[PDB]
Design a protein around this ligand. Sequence first.
Ligand SMILES: [Zn+2]
Ligand SMILES: [Zn+2]
Ligand SMILES: [Zn+2]
Lengths: 586, 78, 103, 187, 190
Amino acid sequence: AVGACVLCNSQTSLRCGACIRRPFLCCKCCYDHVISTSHKLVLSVNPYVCNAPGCDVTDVTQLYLGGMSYYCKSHKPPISFPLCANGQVFGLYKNTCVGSDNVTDFNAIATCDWTNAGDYILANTCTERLKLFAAETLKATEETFKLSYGIATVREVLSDRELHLSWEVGKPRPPLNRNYVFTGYRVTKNSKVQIGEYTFEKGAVVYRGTTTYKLNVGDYFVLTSHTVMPLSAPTLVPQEHYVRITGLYPTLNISDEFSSNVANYQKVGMQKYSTLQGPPGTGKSHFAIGLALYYPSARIVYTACSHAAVDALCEKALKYLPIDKCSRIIPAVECFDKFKVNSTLEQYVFCTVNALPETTADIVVFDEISMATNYDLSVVNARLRAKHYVYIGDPAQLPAPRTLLTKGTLEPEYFNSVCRLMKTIGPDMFLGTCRRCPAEIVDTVSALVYDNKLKAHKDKSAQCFKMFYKGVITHDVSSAINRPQIGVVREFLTRNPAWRKAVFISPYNSQNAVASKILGLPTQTVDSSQGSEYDYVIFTQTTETAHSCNVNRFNVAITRAKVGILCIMSDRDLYDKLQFTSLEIP
Amino acid sequence: SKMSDVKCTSVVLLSVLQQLRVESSSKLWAQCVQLHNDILLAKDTTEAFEKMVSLLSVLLSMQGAVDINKLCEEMLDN
Amino acid sequence: NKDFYDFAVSKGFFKEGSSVELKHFFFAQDGNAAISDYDYYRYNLPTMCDIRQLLFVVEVVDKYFDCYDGGCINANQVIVNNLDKSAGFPFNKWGKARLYYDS
Amino acid sequence: FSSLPSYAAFATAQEAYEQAVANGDSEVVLKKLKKSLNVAKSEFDRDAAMQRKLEKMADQAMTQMYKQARSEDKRAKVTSAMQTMLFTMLRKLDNDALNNIINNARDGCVPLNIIPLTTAAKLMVVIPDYNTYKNTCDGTTFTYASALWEIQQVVDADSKIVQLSEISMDNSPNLAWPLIVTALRAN
Amino acid sequence: FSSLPSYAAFATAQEAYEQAVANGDSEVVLKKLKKSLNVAKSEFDRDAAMQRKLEKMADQAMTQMYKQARSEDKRAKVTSAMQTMLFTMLRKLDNDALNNIINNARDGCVPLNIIPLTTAAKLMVVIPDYNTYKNTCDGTTFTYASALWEIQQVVDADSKIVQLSEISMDNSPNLAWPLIVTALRANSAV
RNA sequence: GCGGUAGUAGCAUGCUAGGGAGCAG
RNA sequence: UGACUGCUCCCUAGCAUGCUACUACCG
Ligand SMILES: [Zn+2]
Ligand SMILES: [Zn+2]
Ligand SMILES: [Zn+2]
């Protein structure tokens, strides 16, 4: 009941009747919320409505406070004083209220459909708590506009990986790839019954098996969502550098295999938070282990948004240093049970943004912070009250798709809370680790956005592929299948012997789904190639209008290779000075 | 004054035990109810204390339940 | 209620040897208590009476109950207080006594 | 109630009539002044009580809403409130056996069943480290809950019997430590 | 309260009278003003009171009729619920044994206490302790009420399955003892 | 000059209706 | 899951009666 309106710094019991999150607005604050826009309904400890039987008044501007109750205008016992009067709304804290100078914060960003770029613009032009309200409202609008599409179901079953699928009544269908997991429920007569986790991309309906299934009649698959609760801890911690190396457990040996570790070790010695801007091969592979060995007993927590990217470190986090000192817990969802699972007690707790309880910790070393709003930062800073932070990440690592984009692409810097801070105050560490990624990618990628931080560490043997091509497009309701550059990729792989050991990633899974029918290259998604980076690669774009060929949405997915790459680009923007070997079409 | 204190403490302890879904085990709940009803009818302050020890042992022998150490660091039990 | 107990103790109450002490509490019962209490109807036995004396005791009792008046009343003269109480079995699955006095 | 136009009108009429009467005058002027004064006086006097009733009623309504909010808040923290209260009273009791078992549970040595009161019946505890064993178990007797018990069995996490002579300072750290002592109450 | 039928006449008379007063005419016009305005306000008084009485009467009537309609709706739904309950419990009467024992009656009337005793398909037994258990339902089939029953399931006071192999004299003090035994009529009904 | 009547305000008295709580058999 | 009666205190709403007061009409 009693929450907090903070812009006016006013405890409140009121809330707007028709709004996004039942937001909390004080007397004068609810007033200029209900006169600057149209929100003529409020909720208190009890809702304001005439109490005579059969009466109906939604409005509050004409209700009266009667005999320990509320009465109204059309049906009027008016022995009272009006509820809305004298620049205020009747409630508790009617005296200890301040008001708002910026009248149109809610009136600007809580009044639109939460999809324009102006929402995020103002969210970055906010305070910590105001931008917390912003991030929670973005999660709320994500779920509330995801719960407006259909539920897939299999009513007569066919052979697995090739079924039939009817959907729903009149609703549209969302995008097509494995972004939306079709994990619904089955109904016997009134109850919900074990179903499993599914995903629909190819349709005759070809399914990808997150598990092996024996589908029965009627089985329904759809994401059923709850609402993210309000959070009680700030996302970012204010920048305060340490007086000394007091309170640390120093070691005697110094890392040697890593050539950019000692100065950054000292930095962690007197740095409180740490974020950098890097593609694969930026210390995310070895520097975490470097800190792990350089301070043994420090409570250091790691996390990636999916377990297959936590695995990229955890696979040898138990080999480089003893097993007894790491863990991450697996809920049951694709998660890897390598470590000591169902064990809160550990030292180097690996984690996933989706789930981890809170006991205690002291040092933060968290991986990518990309595909979520301030929820990711806040849940992990609430997870532990830490003395040191390392926010490994990038505003372009896996930039959060803004659901149904309608109005352009915003500046990459404007991420949750730290990426705009990031290159306005400078990178937190001196760190570049190009021991897998070669210089052929580094040249272009660092000349574009990551200036002078990553090194041209490894040379190339003039095998990088160029072929001038414009291309033609053909789109579907939720994806697109490519004639030209797919054919050119085919007839290119028919020229070189040792090129059929690559990946076939796709902007939407439809490309590899169609290709599996006649060649059969493995399925790959642009969603998250979690901790799985390989040298030889076949990249494809099909349709690239606003999600692909705009900014560094996947310029890290252009950092594919180690000694050789393929990166198909059907536009004429990201080639300005790229010098791939010029060879003619066959 | 040393007897009414133990009776009030026993009432509070039984309430705390009931909050932890103890009555889902008939034998344990019957024993706890018998002990609690016996403490309130006591006349001397030694039998009440041994029954209090027996009743508190039920709460102490439940691992997850509560945090003995946090509830001892809040300017509470030593 | 700890506040009241502390207030009473801070005023010289519940000392040793006092003539005022607590002996009224809320007692708890285990699972098999309702049936154990219902089993007390075993004390009800069939009893034959001395009829020639009961037929005179009833006359004296009726003499005692003689200064009143009674009879039958219509359904609109019945007074009921607290119509928000239980209606019994199986009528408690659908509402209180208000539902059946209104319907 | 001096913030209403009725008060202003009544005050001006009062002043004018008072000045005219104190100056001394005839009957018709007094009659006209009082006929123009009494209506304003009644106008003031009605609101003078209506405002008071409104203010007190508003105060009562705010009181009632505060009470409802506080009750709703209070009935949602009962578990934590009861636990804190129980441990506060347990502090205030100040008994040696209760203090002993509370400290033992706080360090890690908890029981496994209800502590018996008779001169018989079995008690099982868990001893997770050698220091607790050093403090409590010395010889073949066991001191717990301000009483005396006699050890008769030691079982490890692997459920193998360990003889009493085995446990020693350096001879212990090759064992499954969460031991389980089963003793009976000494006379 | 502002467009009453007499409001026009009252306001026009007041305006005309006060204009005449502001004209500074003789005392006769003032007396006429006073009389006319007094009678005008007097006639406006009842027109302002009776209407306010009537509105409150109408509002009370509306409220009473609304609550009557709500009561009727509740009655209809409770009637539907009772009908559904009766017709649902009808479907378990075992209409062959019941008919067989009804026809044997000399006029169609039978005591109610012997209907479950001779037509029920399932039997439930509650056992306090082991001594009572070994005298009533020992083994796998027992006889009660001149019929043969065979055990189907045994649970305890916590509603957890208990196997007959562990209901012994030694293992008795390890069970929540108010045991419930379920059996079926053998050779007859289920 | 006195009384009657019609509204309006404050105050007091007893019932009816609604809600919250206490004790007793 | 919450029976039947009896008594008492508190708060609000309506009705009836009485007291006083302010204007107006009538004789
Ligand atoms: Zn609003
Ligand atoms: Zn506000
Ligand atoms: Zn109304």
